[PDB]
Design a protein around this ligand. Structure first.
Ligand SMILES: [Ca+2]
Ligand SMILES: [Ca+2]
Length: 275
């Protein structure tokens, strides 16, 4: 039987599904460790590998990319779980190796790939403590080209009064996503700062794993795909909205939580955001 992970319901995705909005024809790129295309609960449309020693983007030796991808778009059927945008066209852009590490050049190449291939939405469940002119240039170009760019804020918790948001989330053009639990409380690991935009479920998130498995992961990496997926639903309802409109709608219709330094605008609500 199919289970709906708490997080999907928490963001109010199912209300849209009921309406016939499931992200059809929206191209979402998961820029991560690849996606196991053999998983029965996933449909991968395409992709690319930027990792020189791992040329198949459809082999995920890490497991994270498959897990993020399931949050975005696990199929609606009689097995496994359910994605936020179960009809989205899913792309594996492999930029991390089996060890879950990657060079910046690989990440940037993958963003460039996404722009060139007309992705509507980019999900980056990755982060580093430092940026670069090239990393900023790529995200900025994607946004100027009409792409919704979503990133995990980072898992650095608090640091006195400083921003612990990593890059690329830290850049203004990117939506930065922090993590809450099922009670709407901020996860202790969730990065903080003025650059935090929105919150999404990121604790004990059930999703797909390689080899026809399912399991729970925690992190802002798990929170981000809920927003990427939410962007895909909105785009399925309002195909002519610009990335700017999608972003503003998500940020403006949140359920407000605590201070913006810790929760940004609050918890997304796709039902409200979809109008
Ligand atoms: Ca399923
Ligand atoms: Ca940002």
């Amino acid at each position: 039987a199919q289970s709906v992970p708490y997080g999907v319901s928490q963001i109010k995705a199912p209300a849209l599904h009921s309406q016939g909005y499931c992200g059809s024809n929206v191209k979402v790129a998961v820029i991560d460790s690849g996606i196991d295309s053999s998983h029965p609960d996933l449909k991968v449309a395409g992709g690319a590998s930027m990792v020189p020693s791992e040329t198949n983007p459809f082999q995920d030796n890490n497991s994270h990319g498959t897990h993020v991808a399931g949050t975005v778009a696990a199929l609606n059927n009689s097995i496994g779980v359910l994605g936020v945008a179960p009809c989205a066209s899913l792309y594996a852009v492999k930029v991390l190796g089996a060890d879950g590490s990657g060079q910046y050049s690989w990440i940037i190449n993958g963003i460039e790939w996404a722009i060139a291939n007309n992705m509507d939405v980019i999900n980056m469940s990755l982060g580093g403590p430092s940026g670069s002119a090239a990393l900023k240039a790529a995200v900025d170009k994607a946004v100027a080209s009409g792409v919704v760019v979503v990133a995990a804020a980072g898992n650095e918790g608090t640091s006195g009064s400083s921003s612990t948001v990593g890059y690329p989330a830290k850049y203004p053009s990117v939506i930065a996503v922090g993590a809450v639990d099922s009670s709407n409380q901020r996860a202790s690991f969730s990065s903080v700062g003025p650059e935090l935009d929105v919150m999404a479920p990121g604790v004990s998130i059930q999703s797909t794993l390689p080899g026809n498995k399912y399991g729970a992961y925690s992190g802002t990496s798990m929170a981000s795909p809920h927003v990427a997926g939410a962007a895909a639903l909105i785009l399925s309802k309002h195909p002519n909205w610009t990335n700017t409109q999608v972003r503003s709608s998500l940020e403006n219709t949140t359920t407000k939580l605590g201070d913006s330094f810790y929760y940004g605008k609050g918890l997304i609500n796709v039902q409200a955001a979809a109008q």
